[PDB]
Amino acid sequence: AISKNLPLLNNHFRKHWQERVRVHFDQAGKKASRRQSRLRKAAKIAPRPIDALRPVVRAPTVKYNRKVRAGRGFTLAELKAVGIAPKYARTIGISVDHRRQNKSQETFDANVARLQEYKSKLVIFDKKTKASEVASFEQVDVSATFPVEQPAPESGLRAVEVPEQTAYRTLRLARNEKKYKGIREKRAKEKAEAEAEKAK
Amino acid sequence: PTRLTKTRKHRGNVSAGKGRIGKHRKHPGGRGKAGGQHHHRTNLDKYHPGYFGKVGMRYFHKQQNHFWRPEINLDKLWTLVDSEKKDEYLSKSSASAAPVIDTLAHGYGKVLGKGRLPEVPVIVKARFVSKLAEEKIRAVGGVVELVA
Amino acid sequence: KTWRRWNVKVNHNEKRYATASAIAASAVTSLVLARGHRVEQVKELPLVVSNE
Amino acid sequence: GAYKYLEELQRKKQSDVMRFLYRVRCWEYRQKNVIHRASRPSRPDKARRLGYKAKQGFVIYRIRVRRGGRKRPVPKGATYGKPTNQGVNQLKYQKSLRSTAEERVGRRASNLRVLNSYWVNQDSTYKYFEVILVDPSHKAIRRDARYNWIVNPVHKHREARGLTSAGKKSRGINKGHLFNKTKAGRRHTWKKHNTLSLWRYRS
Amino acid sequence: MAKSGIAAGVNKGRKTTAKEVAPKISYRKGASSQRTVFVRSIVKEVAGLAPYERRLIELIRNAGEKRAKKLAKKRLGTHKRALRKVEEMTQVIAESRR
Amino acid sequence: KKERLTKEAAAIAEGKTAKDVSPKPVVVKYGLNHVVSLIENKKAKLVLIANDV
RNA sequence: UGACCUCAAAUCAGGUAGGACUACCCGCUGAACUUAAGCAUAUCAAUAAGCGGAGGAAAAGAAACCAACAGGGAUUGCCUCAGUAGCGGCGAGUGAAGCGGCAAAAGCUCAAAUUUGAAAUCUGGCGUCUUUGGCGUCCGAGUUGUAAUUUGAAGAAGGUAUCU
RNA sequence: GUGUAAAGUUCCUUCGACGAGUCGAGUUGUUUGGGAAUGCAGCUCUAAGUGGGUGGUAAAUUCCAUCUAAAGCUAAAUAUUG
């Protein structure tokens, strides 16, 4: 049951796995029918675009801080800045997220500029709008028209400024300070009451 | 292909290559890793030392995103410089104007100090550097800028 | 069983290698004759016709 | 409104007043049938919270459920298995008595839709519940835009499928890391995790 | 700024320009109101006290703060809820000594 | 109420506000929520409570 | 002689439930063979059998969420995370989630508020019309609360500049 | 079209009701990757109003972050030996 110099395997096939085998023979058929659904939906609502405009947000965690991606909806503050009521905004292809807030200014400004770029190109029809004017429009892809773009990483040339303390020393000192913050605070405090009670 | 297998060559020979005495059976020795401490001990000791027992402390709910910190050495640091401006940068660079290398935007956590740099000032941006890596960078007239 | 392997993956670059090699072979008369085509009354290969 | 006073008073279940009222009502309910029809909610505020409205087509049924665990119904306690499965006593039903009350009431009044239920009283042998049911064939329900949803056939015996509040509580349908096994149904999650997914171009 | 600007240490992280946020209304959930205080004082007049609340008051009357705290933690379940319970009993006694 | 409604319809037809034709009502306030709200606002002058609720 | 409350009766007027199917779905209940080269925890398996309940899908679903970041943002599925953290006679075995890429994207409703200058609400009967219903009228339901107004993303009551 | 209607939009003031034998705790059983206890259920105890829950090692002290339970509806993407 255990022979030769081989890796030890974890093959989890001790249950009735043969009754739950899902083979995706319909991958091509699903692709084609997905395209047909997409075409029907696009043709139903033309020239109004198929996608709602989405914001741009920072990916969470220390691993994905660098990347920026498409969010769910513009916050109520971002819509407040461009003067669109959220109830109204949902009707003109702008997605809304009541849950997100803006602690920083960079994301808020980027999404405000995104909303302004969208609002500039928006043409809202009405009863007086006739079939010829509507016919003169093309159904765009909102996501491609307003793509989420990564901010440019720093490159080029800059002047060199060398601090006295090395970066390695800076990191070591920061680690040490964080490690001993609590014990140093406790020591300093108890010394404070010791020298403020016996010196009374 | 089934036609190139040895099953097609074993046709006509009684035991199909399994021997007449041994008599290929269901599971002599047990199933899986059975008997690893009893009758397969001689195999586990020889080829998989350290298999049995506990070492170290548990870590409940380990999130691997915290420990994300890909390494880049100094011998590979100039690849992060734009390819078409590398030769121009390598020639005219000076303390008044040196290329800036943001290692974080390229997906790296720590700058390590293996290899030798071109004798050219650079401005390196990293979340972390090793002691020797930063000594080598300042030795060519550069600097390390810590970012977050 | 249906979960037998039916499709096979080929590296994209290798597939393009083969496409280019076959396109090159289409211009060799000995290969076209060996392939089995009646191309003895075509003066030269490749055979290019006007866009009409 | 008096509903705020009712709501705050019903929380003082160990006060003299509520202890007396519970004694009297527990006796009175124990005298009647196991399932009987209540002319009106004994806790009108609690009924309002759970969606009851004083309209024709809303019905209240009081039911009495036996307390305690679930003795394993095997003859003479012999289980015929491994010693880990030999337990007969100290076993517990996986649905609350609230769900059992709703299921039995829904079985009795088979033409109604169980809307919800609530606790009314308690003694050593019985818990007492009041179940709010809706008649889906009454026009006052069929013409009410706030309750038309229950007329749709997906809500046939929603209490027998665990779709009431008590049933969704017992199924572990909640958000977060504490409900990883049961966010989207325990058996659905298990099936998803025990399925071998093979694609055309195997990876 | 509000971050150290480096990847380690106390208050680590990238500096950003903090934007003032208007607090969500849902954060006001635990706030008390005139309506609920007035109703709760009336119900307390009508309801009275639970049997364990009466027993707690006697322990506090007998200078048994340590005794009262243990009974409340046994009854209520947690130490945090017991500490609040013992206090509103101290206020109850303080409002019945006049 | 139907008779008052007819009179107010005639008044609003002739161009009056339907408030200037009917005097302000002085009636018994009933209903539990309504009467509790009146008590809490110190608007009630007398309360009668049934003994068999 | 009358209301009210509770409980009945009727071949009362008009309705409704049950049973069938089984591939998928929502629950409950629930093994053992098997593996561990024995076997009792474990494994098989939170499976088979058994019971209850549906639909064209069901379930879930607009955070008492994930996080610890420069933060994300209902639910579902895929790829990945990952045969990993972890669980385990720490043996045999077993084993998720966050992030990320994508498919699809859609949001909301009550209770808790005095209409109090007017129960403004609703089933039914009867009549009528142009009938998935409208209008009128009479009983009845309902103040132990049916409508309008608000749902935390808010919102209300006053005041406010006009606009859309 | 009954739009002297309804809805939204700015700012100010005062307010701003928000679900209990429930949360939570102990114990028992089952279950889970959940490990001084993941969920569920029984029994006993049983709240509060910036309170309550969560923050994967039990406890106390002090903060911070994040939601707002104990009421409800909702297409699509998904499954499909009938």
The reply to whether E17 has its C-beta less than 7 Å from any atom of strand H is no
**Number of residues assigned to chain D:** 203
Q: State, as a whole number of angstroms, the distance between the CA of D72 and the C1' of G61.
A: 37
CA F3 to chain centroid: 15
Q: Which residues pair with B126 in a beta bridge?
A: B146
The residues, any chain, with a CB within 8 Å of residue F22's CB and separated by 6 or more, are F4, F7, F8
- PDB experimental method: cryo-EM
Distances (CA, A) of E52 to D10, D20, D28, D100, E65: 18, 17, 28, 32, 15
**Overall resolution, Å:** 2.6
Q: Which element (helix H / strand E) includes A194?
A: helix A167-197
Cα distance between residue D74 and residue D88, in whole Å: 8
Cα distance between residue D131 and residue D43, in whole Å: 11
Do residues E15 and A95 lie in contact, with contact meaning Cβ atoms separated by under 8 Å? Answer: no
**Residue B53 is encoded by which pair of tokens?**
């027992």
Q: What is the DSSP string of F1-53?
A: -HHHHHHHHHHHHTT--SSSSSPPP------HHHHHHHHHTT--S-----S--
- Tell me which chain A residues have a C-beta less than 8 angstroms from the C-beta of D196: 17, 20-22
E55, burial (CB in 10 Å: exposed 0-12, middle 13-18, buried 19+)? middle
- Tell me which chain A residues have a C-beta less than 8 angstroms from the C-beta of C3: 21, 23
Alpha helices in E1-98 (DSSP H): 34-47, 51-61, 65-76, 79-94
Q: Give the three-class secondary structure for A68.
A: strand
Q: How far is E7 from chain B (nearest CA, A)?
A: 5
Characterize the bridge pairing of strands A157-158 and B98-102. antiparallel
Do residues D19 and D82 lie in contact, with contact meaning Cβ atoms separated by under 8 Å? Answer: no
Identify the CA nearest to D134 among candidates D117, D114, D156, D154: D114
Do residues E5 and E14 lie in contact, with contact meaning Cβ atoms separated by under 8 Å? Answer: yes
Compare CB distances from E16 to A106, A171, A174 and report the shortest one's residue: A106
Q: Give the three-class secondary structure for D6.
A: helix
Q: Please confirm whether the linkage preceding A47 is cis (ω < 30° from 0).
A: yes
Q: How far is D198 from chain C (nearest CA, A)?
A: 7
Cα distance between residue D190 and residue A15, in whole Å: 12
Identify the CA nearest to D22 among candidates D122, D166, D91, D112: D122
- Tell me which chain D residues have a C-beta less than 8 angstroms from the C-beta of F37: 1
Q: What is the DSSP string of D88-136?
A: -SS---SS-HHHHHHHHHHHHSTTSEEEEEEEEEE-SSEEEEEEEEE-T
Q: In what order do the strands lie in the sheet with A157-158?
A: A157-158, B98-102, B123-126, B143-146
Nucleotides of H under 7 A from a protein CB: 8-10, 15-26, 28-30, 32-35, 38-52, 54-57, 59-61, 66-68, 70-74, 77-81
